[PDB]
Design a protein around this ligand. Sequence first.
Ligand SMILES: CN[C@H](C(=O)N[C@H](C(=O)N(C)[C@H](/C=C(/C)C(=O)O)C(C)C)C(C)(C)C)C(C)(C)c1ccccc1
Ligand SMILES: Nc1nc2c(ncn2[C@@H]2O[C@H](COP(=O)(O)OP(=O)(O)OP(=O)(O)O)[C@@H](O)[C@H]2O)c(=O)[nH]1
Ligand SMILES: Nc1ncnc2c1ncn2[C@@H]1O[C@H](COP(=O)(O)OP(=O)(O)CP(=O)(O)O)[C@@H](O)[C@H]1O
Ligand SMILES: Nc1nc2c(ncn2[C@@H]2O[C@H](COP(=O)(O)OP(=O)(O)O)[C@@H](O)[C@H]2O)c(=O)[nH]1
Ligand SMILES: [Ca+2]
Ligand SMILES: [Ca+2]
Ligand SMILES: [Ca+2]
Ligand SMILES: [Mg+2]
Ligand SMILES: [Mg+2]
Lengths: 439, 430, 54, 346
Amino acid sequence: MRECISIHVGQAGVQIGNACWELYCLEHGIQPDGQMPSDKTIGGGDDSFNTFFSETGAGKHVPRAVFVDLEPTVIDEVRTGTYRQLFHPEQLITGKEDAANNYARGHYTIGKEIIDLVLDRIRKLADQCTGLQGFLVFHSFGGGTGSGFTSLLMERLSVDYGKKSKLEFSIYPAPQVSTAVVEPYNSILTTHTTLEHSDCAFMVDNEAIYDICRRNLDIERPTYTNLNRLISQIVSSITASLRFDGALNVDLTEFQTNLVPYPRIHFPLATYAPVISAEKAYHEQLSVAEITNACFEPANQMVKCDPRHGKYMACCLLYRGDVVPKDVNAAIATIKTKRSIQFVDWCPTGFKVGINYQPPTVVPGGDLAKVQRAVCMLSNTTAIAEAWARLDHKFDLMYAKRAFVHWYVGEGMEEGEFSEAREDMAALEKDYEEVGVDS
Amino acid sequence: MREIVHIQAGQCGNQIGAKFWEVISDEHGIDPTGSYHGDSDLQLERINVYYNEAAGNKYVPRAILVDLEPGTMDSVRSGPFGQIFRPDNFVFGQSGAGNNWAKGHYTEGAELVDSVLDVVRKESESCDCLQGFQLTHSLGGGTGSGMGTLLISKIREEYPDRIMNTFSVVPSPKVSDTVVEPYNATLSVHQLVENTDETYCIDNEALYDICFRTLKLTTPTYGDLNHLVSATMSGVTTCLRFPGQLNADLRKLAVNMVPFPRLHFFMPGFAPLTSRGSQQYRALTVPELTQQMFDAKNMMAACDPRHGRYLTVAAVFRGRMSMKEVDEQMLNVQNKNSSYFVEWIPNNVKTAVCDIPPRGLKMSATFIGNSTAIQELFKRISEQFTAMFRRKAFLHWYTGEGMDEMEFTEAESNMNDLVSEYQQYQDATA
Amino acid sequence: MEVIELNKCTSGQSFEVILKPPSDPSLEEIQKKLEAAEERRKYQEAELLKHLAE
Amino acid sequence: MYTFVVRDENSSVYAEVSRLLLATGQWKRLRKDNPRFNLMLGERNRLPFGRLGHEPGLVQLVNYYRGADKLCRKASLVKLIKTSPELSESCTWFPESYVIYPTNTDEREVFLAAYNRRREGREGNVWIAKGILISSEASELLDFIDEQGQVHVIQKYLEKPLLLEPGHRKFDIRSWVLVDHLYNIYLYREGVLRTSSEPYNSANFQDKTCHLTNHCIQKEYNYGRYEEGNEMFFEEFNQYLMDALNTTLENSILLQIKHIIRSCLMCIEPAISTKHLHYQSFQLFGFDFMVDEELKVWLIEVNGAPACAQKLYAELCQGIVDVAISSVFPLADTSIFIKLHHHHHH
Ligand SMILES: CN[C@H](C(=O)N[C@H](C(=O)N(C)[C@H](/C=C(/C)C(=O)O)C(C)C)C(C)(C)C)C(C)(C)c1ccccc1
Ligand SMILES: Nc1nc2c(ncn2[C@@H]2O[C@H](COP(=O)(O)OP(=O)(O)OP(=O)(O)O)[C@@H](O)[C@H]2O)c(=O)[nH]1
Ligand SMILES: Nc1ncnc2c1ncn2[C@@H]1O[C@H](COP(=O)(O)OP(=O)(O)CP(=O)(O)O)[C@@H](O)[C@H]1O
Ligand SMILES: Nc1nc2c(ncn2[C@@H]2O[C@H](COP(=O)(O)OP(=O)(O)O)[C@@H](O)[C@H]2O)c(=O)[nH]1
Ligand SMILES: [Ca+2]
Ligand SMILES: [Ca+2]
Ligand SMILES: [Ca+2]
Ligand SMILES: [Mg+2]
Ligand SMILES: [Mg+2]
């Protein structure tokens, strides 16, 4: 058993962390006070859930988590909310003033005066770890803290923990719920800076999630709370193999092996089904074939893009609920004949399958209906580069006029860091195109 | 917790400044004594942005009141919310500035400014985390204009990493016949371009025309003009004072609104336009608000927005309404008039919704627009300036206080540079 | 077609199905980068204070 | 007010559609990089399909189907037919064809396999390359291919074309097909024969004003003799099939054409359909057919950005607007197309 530390950075990172640990707690029957009736090794152990929780003699299970925000409002909500007791005060780190939507202010200006403290609070978790594998990091691409401080933090964990794996959960900016017009700038900056330091990153476009909520949960205007509950189910789905017994994706290293042959191309697409509104009076339970087939609908992806026009390098299916291999194999047989699924030549056309029999747990009074069976496909497809293209085009439009750049120069960043970050993305979109297209 | 220090200067500054404290103090349920009597915790969550707390759970505006004559400050002191302001924050001279920028900036004002800074300093030091300063003043007189700009320069010296914001009333000959206003205002604009981060241009041309043409007031008074100012100020500060996501502090607003450090002069608008007293019986639908807040006739700066392009926009809807319908309408204005929004700043329109409406209304909308059409404002001032300056007329009042003609020439040039930069981006394209 | 690495347990099972075969900055360099940015902010601030002083 | 942008200046067809849209006074044109359009009329290359359908508040439609290039490049078309079981190598309406590269994948050896059973049957053995040359002699083409640089196609040449009289002439048929956003397949009722003007010279292959029926290669070498611009339309060609062959256009040719069109597009429907997508596509294709003396129809090529013929621009472009666009974006307040559908039960 090897432990994992979750780092949640900025409002989006924190709020989504909140949502994930609430769900993790309900999944493993851990209560708000930290007590776990089902756990019989009081005060310790090396069960699979202990990858995410440490224990005390008083019988208390505490996240291997650190929340950091440069302003305090959001982490205060954690400190006074339903899960207040679960966390130790030293795990919740806040500043006085925030990064004001500026990567440079978050990286260079405010980053400096707080990086050493955060590394120290992380080190206090790593020294309760018999065999740490590495970290899961949660942040927004578009916030000042989320982008600027995260990339600094990533650089430092590479140095103080070189042999350790780092996974990201990253919120890609959408105008329907964004709060800054500079989100493209921050997004490119932080991507450039974090790319060598990250082993595997799962992007979630707030646009995709927002629409899934309108379309499938009948929510007139989704809030972060709606979005985050949905996101937390996808995350939970992804991490389930680290927290439960199984033989697939049992460690962070395996995510890289199973999902990322070419290191820079480390952005797998997540697709999830079924998402069903809790208010739906009558619901016909969806079969294995049907929800597997929904995994190849763009409408169900975390990023809208079209995988028919790219190539796959890998694909895992992660099932929760009443599912057996026989049904999965038949579903995959019909689906291959019906759909456009082209792998790269240097990869086998196949799927690694993971079934966990426990059906998905939903938050009571949440918007999601309980379902008999659900699935989350993770596919490394060059189609995801469409999201890079979009973000780069917007960056080009603004940067051609130097709009807003003075705000970054004013924090000590050099203008040339902009074009260098943009060169790195140009090469990135180039790498995706070589891999994915022929003539 | 992110405190703002407010300063109000000169007759105009203090008149609108007082009205602002009346209006917001009522939105946050504070009464003339300074006691909370509201019935919502939304009212108090961010009360420390503008009020200090005091013994007996007392709220006290973080407000410095400045003038070179006593007159108006005795009118502040014995108006409705007069008692609420902290008495040692009244800083006043005796002489007045005689509508003369130079006196306010270089002679009479320099004597007073140190005492205002002492009061600013005492207010800055009890602040958990000071975000910056907002100044209310006119640009056409001597104190708010000349001394006000002096203050700004000095505050930036002591707090160079805090945000500076002004609500600056621009003069118009439709409202004042004092002949040197264009001088005073060109000299102030010079200061403003260099040393503020955000300026709300509140044009007395526009406020008068709104009162006359739209509110059908045949003899608008300063009371009527100020009712419009206070509603706009209430609206443009909503996101700072209530819980919220977008433009919730001065720095974040600035980053969203100012693509180029010099182009930080904003056009505010309001819907629905009301005259004081008379009630408004129909609530507006969300479409009417949207169409109106973007109407030229609802702008507090007398510029035609169809003559420019919007660099950035912030919209704030107040009241109980469908966010779905607001997003739809906000999206429909941009998609139906997309050529008026610069295409090289994607998604440049940002929209917030606060559940508390302003007193007297079920629904309202405030618009803040950084548009290239504001150049019309600076050209107008510049035309009036040049007509006098080219014969050196009225200059002896300024040269008599130590100034050189050079200083006028530099100022005219800087304001003409400003105007051409607006033009540059008006014409730009991807 | 071909199922492999079948693993079963009380919680679930996993396997692979195959339809077709084939055919770094130092602590130092960081503290530097941050420190240069800070000097750049100090210079920018000093120039302004120089200007305010004139 | 719907809005649109134009990103191919050189398109005969969409020039006309702009004009028709503007003229409704319910469409406003935007500058080419303004992202807030209902409709894009796109460039021919590196069209940014990846930036479509992410402007909230706007239903977005484009005049190309991403992926349709697989139909419309000779290389890919040939590949698509062999490889796709719905089409297959059995396929009897496409000329036996082969992809060949220079030596600067390939199936050169497999080309020879057939070349040396026609030289071991002494029958017809004329082939065609893809700048384009016909020869009986393999290496005169193979050495022609390596000496040109690009990837090419070798295709059995059709020695026994149907010939028009008077003239002993050759021709191809060009049909215009509109596929809308619902994947309705609409065949425009007017098509056109693109005739040769100079008797089909069998035993000589250099004098190519007779073997190639391209409007441009006839002009620049008897142009205008039997019909305007070497263009025979359908009333005429039908009438001639009646008089001279006792049949109709519908029966002898058009059924094969409809069949061939349906099969090509149904084949790729799963790969390109925009049915569940966040943006919507339509596209005008031009299919090019040969007819042999037996009245057997053969598919020559598919064009992804076809031009119309002068007389027909008006009617076609109106019809593109009617069915492709105003179906997605209705106005306030005689069908020139034949819809291709067929659900046989087996
Ligand atoms: C003689 N100038 C007029 C004026 O000053 N009028 C004054 C005026 O209207 N004043 C001062 C108002 C203000 C108050 C408080 C009031 O109580 O009236 C206006 C300007 C808002 C006044 C008091 C002399 C009648 C003025 C309105 C500027 C004007 C300008 C151009 C063409 C015609 C009239
Ligand atoms: N899905 C989701 N997105 C969020 C949430 N909170 C903020 N965002 C998004 O993240 C981006 C804004 O970043 P934030 O996380 O607010 O920024 P921050 O990290 O707090 O940075 P500063 O405030 O600049 O210090 C925008 O695209 C928002 O839509 C959240 O709870 N869920
Ligand atoms: N296998 C074959 N048998 C007989 N004739 C053929 C043939 N392949 C091509 N041709 C003739 O050559 C002409 C031109 O070939 P093709 O149409 O492939 O080139 P192209 O793409 O440059 C013109 P377009 O795009 O309008 O079809 C055809 O119209 C036809 O007359
Ligand atoms: N809108 C408005 N404008 C005012 C008011 N009082 C004065 N003005 C205008 O302000 C300018 C005169 O400045 P004033 O503030 O009186 O001079 P100061 O006291 O020396 O700063 C002229 O343009 C006047 O029209 C007011 O209460 N409201
Ligand atoms: Ca235990
Ligand atoms: Ca004196
Ligand atoms: Ca002193
Ligand atoms: Mg934040
Ligand atoms: Mg006065």
